[PDB]
């Protein structure tokens, strides 16, 4: 943790060290009081700003490592792309338990750091796919509504949904070119 | 001492003149036959 205003030690104001393997993803809470972290150690941890103590630890026998993290527009839940080709969801309120029903399945992502995004209104969730496609699911029922094929025949690791447009999404990956879907 | 390394014979012992051994003073007449050789390392070794 750095604070560019501080010149001491180049601004390194805090170090979090409870993870045991390479960090995979980082994501702040919308209010910036806490942040989420994922690691190759197969655990997810929640931290208070500048305090080297994880307030929550998310780990399970069947839980795979989560290469990507994002927060739902409502600020009530966060989602994690998992190596088991699934997307899980977790509450953003104390104890942060895993949501037993909001699980999105269908795409392929094992072996790739594939990002996931939410529609501007939070009505939908979407993600890339290792076989050059863009999946999209309904946020309420988690039902897969579409899987658009993206040119280039390469993994589409980058996906983002426009914060104001009703349906414009951008994606890219190993093909190099950036594509817009609508 | 446990920390003291064994002394070098040629540097610390070989040059010091040895002290007297335990030799009971023999009588010139009562020990005439033994006096000249009793305390040798191998008494009479050279006497054929």
């Amino acid at each position: 943790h750095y604070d560019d205003r501080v010149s001491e030690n180049q601004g390194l104001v805090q170090t979090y060290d409870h993870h045991l393997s390479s960090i995979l993803a980082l994501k702040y809470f919308p209010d910036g009081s806490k942040f989420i972290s994922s690691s190759e150690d197969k655990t997810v941890r929640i931290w208070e700003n500048q305090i080297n103590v994880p307030i929550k630890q998310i780990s399970d026998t069947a839980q795979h490592s989560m290469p990507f993290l994002n927060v739902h527009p409502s600020q009530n839940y966060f989602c994690a792309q998992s190596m088991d080709n699934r997307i899980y969801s977790f509450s953003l309120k104390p104890k942060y338990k895993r949501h037993p029903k909001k699980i999105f399945k269908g795409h392929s992502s094992a072996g790739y750091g594939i990002s996931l995004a939410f529609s501007g209104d939070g009505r939908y969730i979407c993600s890339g796919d290792s076989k050059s496609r863009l999946f999209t699911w309904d946020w309420n029922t988690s039902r897969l509504l579409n899987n658009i094929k993206i040119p280039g025949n390469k993994p589409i690791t980058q996906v983002d949904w426009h914060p104001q447009e009703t349906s414009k999404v951008i994606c890219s990956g190993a093909a190099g070119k950036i594509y817009v879907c609508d | 001492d446990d920390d003291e390394p064994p002394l070098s014979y040629e540097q610390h012992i070989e040059n010091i003149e040895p002290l007297d051994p335990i030799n009971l003073p023999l009588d010139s007449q009562d020990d005439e036959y033994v006096k000249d050789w009793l305390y040798d390392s191998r008494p009479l070794e050279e006497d054929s």
Binding site: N52, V53 | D1
Partner: protein
Amino acid sequence: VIQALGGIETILEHTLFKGTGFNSWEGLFWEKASGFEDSMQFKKLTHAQRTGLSQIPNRRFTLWWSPTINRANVYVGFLVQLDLTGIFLHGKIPTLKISLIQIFRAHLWQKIHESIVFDICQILDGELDVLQIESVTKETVHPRKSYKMNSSAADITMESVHEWEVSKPSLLHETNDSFKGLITNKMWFDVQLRYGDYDSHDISRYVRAKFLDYTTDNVSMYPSPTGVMIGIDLAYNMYDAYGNWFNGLKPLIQNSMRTIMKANPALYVLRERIRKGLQIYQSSVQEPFLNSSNYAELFNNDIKLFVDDTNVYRVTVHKTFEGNVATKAINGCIFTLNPKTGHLFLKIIHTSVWAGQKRLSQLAKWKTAEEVSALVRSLPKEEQPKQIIVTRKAMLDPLEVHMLDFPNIAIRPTELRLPFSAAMSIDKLSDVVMKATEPQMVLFNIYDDWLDRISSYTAFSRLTLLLRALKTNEESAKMILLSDPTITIKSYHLWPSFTDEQWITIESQMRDLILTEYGRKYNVNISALTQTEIKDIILGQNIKAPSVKRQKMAELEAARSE
């Protein structure tokens, strides 16, 4: 059977009794009904942990008879020196070994040696003109010298202004030494510690033997062939000296060794540890603990510090991969407060302190004592505290050992249960402690600026109410403190900038929260209690303590008066 064994005298000669310093054999009341193993037998323990509890009483028994169990007159037995001590075990006896290790733990043997050496140095430092000493030098001996039992070195060397007419080597109490003849300009002192046994405990022959052996030995060690060999037998509380004497030195060493043996605190620590190892106790308290009856002494002009270890070792619990829950250490702090000025020396105990260590509950007490010692050494003599108030019994022994380097600092226990543990409820202190990235000392005035308007005892009482309230119910106490959003807590402050008129209302709300929750929890009618009982509730006075009895009489005598 007592008569057949030769009476109490003969029986006790086989025991460690003389080393305990206990006054009389009559007071030898063994606490046959309490001990650690008695507290442990009910707990959730594994079969291994239960079988291991029997070692404790066996250790006590072995320690009591240790002078006989480790006697020198044995049929066979290679001498094995016990680590960090000058004790030799004539055989491998694990139960004895471990009990002796428990007594000499925290490097006590080396501390005793240095303490006595410093005492002799400090005495000689005042006799420069009387004894015609040009200078006194405390030698930079090898770190293990105090338990190097086959050779030695001078601990102290003194240079004369002119020269001294020294007698032949003689015992400390030998009368009429001839000072004529031998003359020397440099004299040395060597303090030898030993641990006698039932066969070998004649300290006089020991000191003579050490003096003659080390002076005649071919080793280059002493700066001159003239000096004094001082010997102390730790197992038998015996002392003697042998060496050259000059006019006036012998009487001085006789008087000083008698005083050092009686008053030196390191030897006292050794005696108390032996008694603890035996579970024998004597009521030897000369000054009363800090109590609700004498707490006004806190505000005396003498410098004093409260020390609280409660937050030194702190842990968070998390689920392990195996399915258990593991404790992980987090940042802690040592609460050191001067109640007169309000200066709080908050030592942040960063997690890196515990890296790779186990048995942290124990190590944290030693860490607290070590940081207190570092703080004291960081203060100039005129600023060092005259007394340190130990809020928890667990800290007494570690601090007593670490304070052997500061023999003028009185250690004072307390009968109070002061709420300093609730200091981590103060948002600013919690923040500073939890965000620290390295070991650090942070200073705060726990009274902020109240001292410009109220007395120190008033500030301490206000602080006590705020802390005891936070300890009683943190959320409702915080609700009281933050009841008005206009009263901003300034920077460089811990509490809101209330005026004293507002402080009276805050104190009333805190007081009521504390007393109503106490009355509810214990079903005590606060209205029936006496003024002193209410005081004892806010201060947390131990109701079982004798001071409550004596204070009751100190007021019922007035109830007789008029």
